[PDB]
Write a protein that binds this ligand. Structure first.
Ligand SMILES: [Zn+2]
Ligand SMILES: [Zn+2]
Ligand SMILES: [Zn+2]
Length: 178
């Protein structure tokens, strides 16, 4: 197995996947690595299994249909994995914890949002459809773009949104377009 966490790329107290060489800190894995379970399969393996069991799940889909899906166990897992893929990028640090807004010439957003809040929300089964999760994730980046205006720091929102959107299209097998 790897000797660094797959998400944060640091060593420490790591849990090893039994079906692939990935390793994780307890709370870097989403969901948090489970107490017992020998063997244990990580989220990457669990997602691969879903795809392998239903190869047709990789044919293209319309985003509008995906968003209306209820959060049954497989859709719950897919959103957990999508959230984890964002945390895997080091630029996610900027969006992880609760922001505050005090900049001359800008007003804070009406509805602040951050990754750890989305994480808690998923853990607590607060989203009934994929749409709820996706709206909160997109809101993180939209709030950032709006607040930072022409400061070059706005680009961090663009960058992390692009990681989100690429992984959304991959995980949910969104139909490719130009
Ligand atoms: Zn980690
Ligand atoms: Zn694995
Ligand atoms: Zn099938």
């Amino acid at each position: 197995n790897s000797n660094i966490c797959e998400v944060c790329n640091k060593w420490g107290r790591l849990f090893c996947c039994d079906t692939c060489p990935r390793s994780f800190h307890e709370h870097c894995h989403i969901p948090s690595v489970e107490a017992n379970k020998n063997p244990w399969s990580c989220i990457f393996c669990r997602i691969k299994t879903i795809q392998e069991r239903c190869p047709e799940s990789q044919s293209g889909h319309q985003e509008s249909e995906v968003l209306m899906r209820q959060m049954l166990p497989e859709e719950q897992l897919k959103c957990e994995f999508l959230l984890l893929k964002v945390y895997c990028d080091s630029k996610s640090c900027f969006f992880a914890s609760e922001p505050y807004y005090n900049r001359e010439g800008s007003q804070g957003p009406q509805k602040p949002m951050w990754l750890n809040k989305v994480k808690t929300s998923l853990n607590e089964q607060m989203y009934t459809r994929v749409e709820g999760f996706v709206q909160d994730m997109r809101l993180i980046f939209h709030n950032h773009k709006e607040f930072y205006r022409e400061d070059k720091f706005t680009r961090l929102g663009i960058q992390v949104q692009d990681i989100f959107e690429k992984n959304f299209r991959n995980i949910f097998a969104i139909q490719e377009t130009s």
